[PDB]
Every structure is written in structure tokens, then in C-alpha cells.
Design a protein around this ligand. Structure first.
Ligand SMILES: [Mg+2]
Ligand SMILES: [Mg+2]
Ligand SMILES: [Mg+2]
Ligand SMILES: [Mg+2]
Ligand SMILES: [Mg+2]
Ligand SMILES: [Mg+2]
Ligand SMILES: [Mg+2]
Ligand SMILES: [Mg+2]
Ligand SMILES: [Mg+2]
Ligand SMILES: [Zn+2]
Lengths: 94, 60, 91, 114, 69, 244
RNA sequence: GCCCUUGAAAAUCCGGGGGAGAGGGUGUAAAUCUCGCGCCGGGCCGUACCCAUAUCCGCAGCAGGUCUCCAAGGUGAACAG
RNA sequence: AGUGCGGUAACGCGACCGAUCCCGGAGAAGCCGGCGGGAGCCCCGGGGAGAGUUCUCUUUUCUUUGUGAAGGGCAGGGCGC
RNA sequence: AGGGCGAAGCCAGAGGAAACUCUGGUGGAGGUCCGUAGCGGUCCUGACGUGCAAAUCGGUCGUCCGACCUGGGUAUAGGGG
């Protein structure tokens, strides 16, 4: 499961939550992975999906809706897009 | 003659129980009295915060 | 039960209309004024606009739903059946 | 106190008969009749509830008088559509066409395979 | 009406074909110069008195120059 | 004596329908090559309220496939429709909700509404509010389909004739009590002059056949022939059985 | 906030997408949903006064009826008296 | 070469070609509550000009104390930019 | 007009192991109450009863955000509306 591996990333690794910030992380070429909630707007997703394709970056569609993902980042707010810059000691990146 | 009497009403006069016809809330509405207070205390709080007297968390 | 023991939303109606009717209204009267979650952004803003039409204020997604609920049960059960048959037809 | 009368034969207080008080140089309060409140145009997108920027919200038969620059804005879809909905239309219309090309490529490979 | 800020500009407006009366209001502390045209009544505020007295001479062919009192 | 309230509703006049603010008819798309052979795609531009109607409607806009021109329709909203959704329709339409396709295509047990009673009629059966029909069974030859209507009846139908998949939106309207007479008044005012209704027992015996008497009684049997001249046909018409 | 109520049409006016066309050939052109200025025009009918314990309708200068706008000080909850 | 230019952008600048065609907007929206801003009026403290009172008292009480539209500037509101 | 009652939602504090409950606020619901204009028309079986009036007057009354009141336009005509 992905929730478990994220937990560790959020604890120990470096990361960034949200679309304005993750698109800046990909555009820098630092972002190693991009998680998308399922409810994300369709235009947004396809835009991000293209940005990863240009930057040769992983894109993982999360199983849950943006409330679940934010819950799954350990935040009381809700996150639709999340980039993983440096995982701490997790194998979120395979 | 009125002006003179209004000056009496300032001193606190012709204003006792037996010269009131309206309910207290009609005479000074509780909502307005509340509105004043919030608009005071809140104004006091954000002045305190914006002088670094009190921190974010205290303020809240 | 701060202000009322057992009328809540239907305390507006006062004594009128009878106990059963007012109890019967309390169910709907609640649900219809409820703010639901916009399964589109995920904010709690799905609010009935008029009968059968619910609008997210943020999402701006107007959504044909039930008369007093964003979803009827009937609609939900119909949805799943159609999805099942769709898969049965095409394979 | 100076009370006053309407200046036109329309007695009734209506959408048409709206007024305001004005002190003249003659030092008499007089009614002036007021012009209706114009609205800025809403977006062609139709989801963005907010009305458009950089346009003189004025009663539509005025626009006639106004200069072109007042009536619009320097952009593609200028003064017809809000920016946000343009820059989403743009990248949408682009990203869509890139996938249409990808499906065309996957179709052509499948023809060459078969 | 229209206020003007350059003594030259008012001189150019006064020199048009459409113009006529160029009445002059000594307000004390101000001395305006109101020059009527077809459309607009142009005015020009000239704070100095000697500069207003100088301009008085500079209006051209025999316009009204109907000084106001 | 008098022409009775009831006979009078036929002349229209006061009893005609109120239709100023009504947003239009709530049809289906008309058939054409695209509908007939493939599937035309349109988008749901908005969802609407239509006075005197419990179902909400849906402005659905397509592209006319002949003139450069964006034609638009008023579908009755299938429940679970929303804006910025696409609404495909035709023979080769995908069997999901808010998607109008011929009854012959769609499998058995398939729930539909706004279902064409006769091919090309533009959507006549089951278009109320919480209502729908179910496609029972197909006869491939004869090109006919059996459909179960909300009344219970099991009507036979041409397999060509279309329907929107899913039930009608705004269901369970009638679970809420009305309570206030006022609330009744406000319902029928956006419809037609049919409300506060006076019982023929109340009336004098010139304006209704139950009228008159020293006691508000009917006096004759309240069941009646349907070979009955208009003016008597009152109470329970052709009532097969009458009680609880 | 309320609605099993969802609360006018049209004339008229504008914006945008498109890009069929048009412009002159190195001082000018077509162009100004023209910017600023300049010139000429805007016909037809209504326009007195009353509008109500005396100009209206109730046979009348009839205690009846007849749609609106404006709306000072004091007392007082108050357009109450 | 030349169917204007500025701003990261919201957008800006006095003008800035363009047809049939298309899309959009404005015209074009219920009632009720609360709160806020702007005026008119009222109020208070004073300046003046004219008043009334004055047997005694009263720096008195009373009146009056202005700037149209249209432009330009600037507050002051609002913004789901 | 102006008052009364104070429904949902919201805040804090206190208790509760939890479930949740109490206390104080805020909030302002309603074919809610009082009560003006408005609309009406209970009683006095008052006045009047060759009247002010071919149905009026006085007090007293009902209702006063809603099946509210109301102008103009428009529809329905006689065994018909
Ligand atoms: Mg008019
Ligand atoms: Mg502009
Ligand atoms: Mg009777
Ligand atoms: Mg009979
Ligand atoms: Mg006159
Ligand atoms: Mg008068
Ligand atoms: Mg009597
Ligand atoms: Mg007598
Ligand atoms: Mg008399
Ligand atoms: Zn937009």
C-alpha cells in the first residue's frame, strides 16, 4: 500500500503539497514523483501528466480523493497534487 | 427649553424607571450593544498583535 | 438539546400542523438544508438550490440530484445496475 | 424643512422614476433624476460568477458612445471572457491536440503491426 | 467646460476660426481667461497679474476681449 | 341548472395553464443520421428549474452537423447529471447514465426515462420526477420491445424508439408534507387554476349533482357509468371496485 | 435566510472567434467599433388648472368613494396620541 | 520591413483595417433579514449679518449662513483579479 | 411604523472515561403575538332612519410578511360566465 510508504516520506523525506508548488518543483527538475488525487480537475491532471513526461518524472495516481490524500499526508487539510522531492528512507520510489 | 432639559438628561435625570415607556432592548438594542463590544475588543486584540504584544496563538 | 428537547429545525412551526407531520418534516427539513461535500473539489459546499438541483459554490458544478438529498437511494441503486450491465454487454 | 416634488408627470416611484437630492447654486434642494446602474459583462465561460475587469460597466446603449479601449481588453478573447478561462482553454486545447496526436500514432503503429 | 494649463495652448485655442468672445475675469488672486468656442468654454487660470496684463495684449486680430465687470 | 365546475375547465379561459416563466418543452433530440447510425456528443451547459415541474431540466448543447451552428436542447435531467459533463446519444451510444439510446440496443433490466412512446416523438413516457421505466424484453424480429411503465402496465414498444438511461431527477418530492395551505397555494399558482377545491356536496343542487339536501350527503351512489353525459360524470367514474 | 413559489419578453447596444477581402509601394495609401477638434439637422401630438370635506364618480359645493411622491421640533419604543 | 505600442501578470495607453458566418454579453429580474459606505434632514459647539426679549436675569433666544449637468483630479467603498 | 416571543446554525466555559450533557452568549426562524398605515367590519341590536349617505357616522372591534393590500393592462357573457 501507498499510504504506509508516504507516511515515512512525510516524516523523514522532503516533499511539497499542492499544484502551484509541485509544478514549480517539476519545472526545477527536483521532483522525483507526483501523486494525484482521483478527484483532481481533469485539465489539471493532464497538464501535470505532460509536465512529468517532459521532465521524465514518475506520476502515481492515488487511489483516493483529495481529502483522503491529505489525510494520507498527515494534514488536516486536503491535497489534490503532491510531489516527492527526496524520500527519506522509504521505497515510495521503487 | 428643550436644550436645557437635554442637559438634565445628560446629568442623569428624568430617566428613572417611571419615565421609561419602551422596553430596555428598544431603548438600547442588545445586538447593537454586542456589536459595539466585539468591535472594541477585537480592535484591542488586533492592535495588541500588530505591536508584537501578543503572539498569533494567544490572539486566536 | 440546548434550547429544545425534541423539535430542533421544526421548532419554527410552533404548535401548528400536528406532532406526526412535524416529526415527519424534521427528517427532510434537515437533509434539504444540509451542506454536503462536492465530490469534485471535496469542499463541503453542495447546497440544494431548488428541488432536484444542487450546486457547489466553489466547484460551480450544478448537479441534478434528489428533491431533499444530493442522492436518492433509487438513483444510487440504478447507477450500479447500469454499470454492471454496461460491463456485461461490452466485456 | 424643504420638502419637494417630482419634476416629471410620472408620479409613481418606479425603476424609471429614480432620483437624488441636489443643492443648486440657487440654494434650493431639487430632485435630479438618476441614470440606471450599468453592469460589467459576465464571462463567455459561464462558470466564473465574477464579472469582467477593465470594462466600463455602463448601460448597454451607451457602449455606442464609448471608445473601443473602454469596451474591451488587450488579450485573445478580450472583454468577452475572463483570463483564467482563456489560459485553461489554451492549455486544454493544446493538451487535447497532443493526445489526439498520440492516439493517431498508436493507431498508425497498430496498422503497421497488422 | 475645459480648464487649460499652458498659456500657449489657450493662445492656440483663441486663434481658431470657431472662437469668439475672450472675456477676462479679474477675480483678485487669479485672473481667468474664458474663451468661448463652438463646443466648449475654455478657461485658463493665470495666477500672476503682470503676466495676465501681458497676455491681454497677445490676443490677435480684433476678437471681442469683453473684459468682465 | 348550471354548467358545473369541471364542464367549465374544457373551455380554457381561466383554467388554461400558466406558462410565462416555463423554460420550454423538455424534449429529446430529434433523430438524424448521426443519432440513427452513430452517436452525437453534446455537453450539459446547465441544469435548470422549470416552474410547474418537479423534474429539473438540462440545457444540453450539441453541434448541428450541417451548419456551423451550436444547437441546444432541453433534456429532463437524469439523476446524477451535472454540468461540464458530456451527453452522448444515438444507436452507438455507450450504456451509461444521461445518455439517450434506443430501447432495442440497451439490455434487459435497463432503467430508463423520457422514453419515446412512438419512434421520433421526442420523449413521452416516464418523465415526471422520481420515475422511470424498465426495458423488459426484446423480440428481435418484429423489431419490438416490452417495457414496464411506472403505472405498472407492461406496454409494447418499437425497438427503434429512444430513451435516456437512468431515472428522473428530484425524486421523493412527495415525501415532504405540505403543511400550510399557503404552501399548496404556491404550488398550483405556478401551474394552473385548480386549487382550493370545493366538494360537490357543499354546492347547491344546480351546480353539482351531489348538491342540495338538508344534510351534506350525496344522496345517490357516487360511482357512475362512463357512458355518462358530462354534467353527471362526477365522483367515481367507471369504478370497478370502490372501497379500501 | 425562504421556496413541491426559483421570481418577463423583445426592440436596441456592445464584446469576442474567425479571416473572405482591401491598401500603397519607400512617401504615401487604403484604414480609423476614431482620437481630438469643425459644419448642418432633429418633424408630428400632449403641455392651462383641479386632483378633492367646492373643478372627478355617487341626480348636488353630499360625512361616501377614488392610484402615488415629499414629509421639520418636543415627549415617547414609535409614521401612536 | 512597416494593418500601433507598454507591462512577469491582473491589465494599460487617444486612435489602432476587415465581410457573410459563428459565440457571448448587456437590455434582464423574487421576497426577507443583517451589517457597512455615501448623501438630504435633524442635533451639538462656535464665528458673522439681521431679530425678538430686556421690571430682574440671559456673551440671549429666532432667522439666515450656496454652488446644476458634463468633464478632469482625488478620497471613500468593493473585487469570486 | 415600533415592540414581544427567541427555532435551526455558531462560540466559549464546565462536566463526562466515552456517548454526549449542562451553563452563559450569539443568531434571528415563523401562513408567530402585540400594534400603526393599509385591508376589513364583531358588538353597542349606539347615532342616523322624509339621512350627510338608495347602507353613511361614532366608539368598540378582527387582521396587519401572507392563501397580504392595491393601480393600470388582459381573459371569461346570459341557461352563459
Ligand atoms: Mg417607463
Ligand atoms: Mg481597458
Ligand atoms: Mg349551502
Ligand atoms: Mg342536477
Ligand atoms: Mg402643469
Ligand atoms: Mg393635495
Ligand atoms: Mg341600530
Ligand atoms: Mg327622526
Ligand atoms: Mg352638514
Ligand atoms: Zn472564467
Amino acid at each position: 500500500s501507498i499510504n504506509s510508504r508516504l507516511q515515512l516520506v512525510m516524516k523523514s523525506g522532503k516533499y511539497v503539497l499542492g499544484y502551484k508548488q509541485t509544478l514549480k518543483m517539476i519545472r526545477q527538475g527536483k521532483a522525483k514523483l507526483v501523486i494525484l488525487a482521483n478527484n483532481c480537475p481533469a485539465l489539471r491532471k493532464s497538464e501535470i501528466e505532460y509536465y512529468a513526461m517532459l521532465a521524465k518524472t514518475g506520476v502515481h495516481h492515488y487511489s483516493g480523493n483529495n481529502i483522503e490524500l491529505g489525510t494520507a499526508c498527515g494534514k488536516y487539510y486536503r491535497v489534490c497534487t503532491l510531489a516527492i522531492i527526496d524520500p527519506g528512507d522509504s521505497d515510495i520510489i521503487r | 427649553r428643550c436644550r436645557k432639559n437635554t442637559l438634565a438628561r445628560r446629568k442623569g435625570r428624568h430617566m428613572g424607571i417611571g419615565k421609561r415607556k419602551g422596553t430596555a432592548n428598544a431603548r438600547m438594542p442588545e445586538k447593537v450593544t454586542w456589536m459595539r463590544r466585539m468591535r472594541i475588543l477585537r480592535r484591542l486584540l488586533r492592535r495588541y498583535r500588530e505591536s508584537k504584544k501578543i503572539d498569533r496563538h494567544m490572539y486566536h | 438539546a440546548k434550547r429544545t428537547k425534541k423539535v430542533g429545525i421544526v421548532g419554527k412551526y410552533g404548535t401548528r400542523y400536528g406532532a406526526s407531520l412535524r416529526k415527519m418534516v424534521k427528517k427532510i427539513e434537515i437533509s434539504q438544508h444540509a451542506k454536503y461535500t462536492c465530490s469534485f473539489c471535496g469542499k463541503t459546499k453542495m447546497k440544494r438550490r431548488a428541488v432536484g438541483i444542487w450546486h457547489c459554490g466553489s466547484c460551480m458544478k450544478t448537479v441534478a440530484g434528489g428533491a431533499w438529498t444530493y442522492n436518492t437511494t433509487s438513483a444510487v441503486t440504478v447507477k450500479s445496475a447500469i454499470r454492471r450491465l454496461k460491463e456485461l454487454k461490452d466485456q | 424643512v424643504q420638502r419637494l416634488t417630482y419634476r416629471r408627470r410620472l408620479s409613481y416611484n418606479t425603476a424609471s422614476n429614480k432620483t437624488r437630492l441636489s443643492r443648486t447654486p440657487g440654494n434650493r434642494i431639487v430632485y435630479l433624476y438618476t441614470k440606471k446602474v450599468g453592469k460589467a459583462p459576465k464571462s463567455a465561460c459561464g462558470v466564473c460568477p465574477g464579472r469582467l475587469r477593465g470594462v466600463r460597466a455602463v448601460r448597454p446603449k451607451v457602449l455606442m458612445r464609448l471608445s473601443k479601449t473602454k469596451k474591451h481588453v488587450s488579450r485573445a478573447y478580450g472583454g468577452s471572457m475572463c483570463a483564467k478561462c482563456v489560459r485553461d482553454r489554451i492549455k486544454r486545447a493544446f493538451l487535447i491536440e497532443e493526445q489526439k496526436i498520440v492516439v493517431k500514432v498508436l493507431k498508425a503503429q497498430a496498422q503497421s503491426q497488422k | 467646460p475645459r480648464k487649460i494649463e499652458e498659456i500657449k495652448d489657450f493662445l492656440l485655442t483663441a486663434r481658431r476660426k470657431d472662437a469668439k468672445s475672450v472675456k477676462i475675469k479679474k477675480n483678485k488672486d487669479n485672473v481667468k481667461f474664458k474663451v468661448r468656442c463652438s463646443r466648449y468654454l475654455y478657461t485658463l487660470v493665470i495666477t500672476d497679474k503682470e503676466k495676465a496684463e501681458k497676455l491681454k495684449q497677445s490676443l490677435p486680430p480684433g476678437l471681442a476681449v469683453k473684459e468682465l465687470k | 341548472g348550471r354548467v358545473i365546475r369541471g364542464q367549465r375547465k374544457g373551455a380554457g379561459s381561466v383554467f388554461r395553464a400558466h406558462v410565462k416563466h416555463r423554460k420550454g418543452a423538455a424534449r429529446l433530440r430529434a433523430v438524424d443520421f448521426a443519432e440513427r447510425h452513430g452517436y452525437i456528443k453534446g455537453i450539459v451547459k446547465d441544469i435548470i428549474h422549470d416552474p410547474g415541474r418537479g423534474a429539473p431540466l438540462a440545457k444540453v448543447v450539441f453541434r448541428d452537423p450541417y451548419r456551423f451552428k451550436k444547437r441546444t436542447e432541453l433534456f429532463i435531467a437524469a439523476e446524477g447529471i451535472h454540468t461540464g459533463q458530456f451527453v452522448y446519444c444515438g444507436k452507438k451510444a455507450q450504456l451509461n447514465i444521461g445518455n439517450v439510446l434506443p430501447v432495442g440496443t440497451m439490455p434487459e433490466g435497463t432503467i430508463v426515462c423520457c422514453l419515446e412512446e412512438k419512434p421520433g416523438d421526442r420523449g413521452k413516457l416516464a418523465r415526471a420526477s422520481g420515475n422511470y421505466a424498465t426495458v423488459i424484453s426484446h423480440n428481435p424480429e418484429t423489431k419490438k420491445t416490452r417495457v414496464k411503465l411506472p403505472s405498472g402496465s407492461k406496454k409494447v414498444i418499437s425497438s427503434a424508439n429512444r430513451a435516456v438511461v437512468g431515472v428522473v431527477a428530484g425524486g421523493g418530492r412527495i415525501d415532504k408534507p405540505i403543511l400550510k395551505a399557503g404552501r399548496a397555494y404556491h404550488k398550483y399558482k405556478a401551474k394552473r387554476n385548480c386549487w382550493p377545491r370545493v366538494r360537490g356536496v357543499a354546492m347547491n343542487p344546480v351546480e353539482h349533482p351531489f348538491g342540495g339536501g338538508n344534510h351534506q350527503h350525496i344522496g345517490k351512489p357516487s360511482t357512475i357509468r362512463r357512458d355518462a353525459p358530462a354534467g353527471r360524470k362526477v365522483g367515481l367514474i367507471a369504478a370497478r371496485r370502490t372501497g379500501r
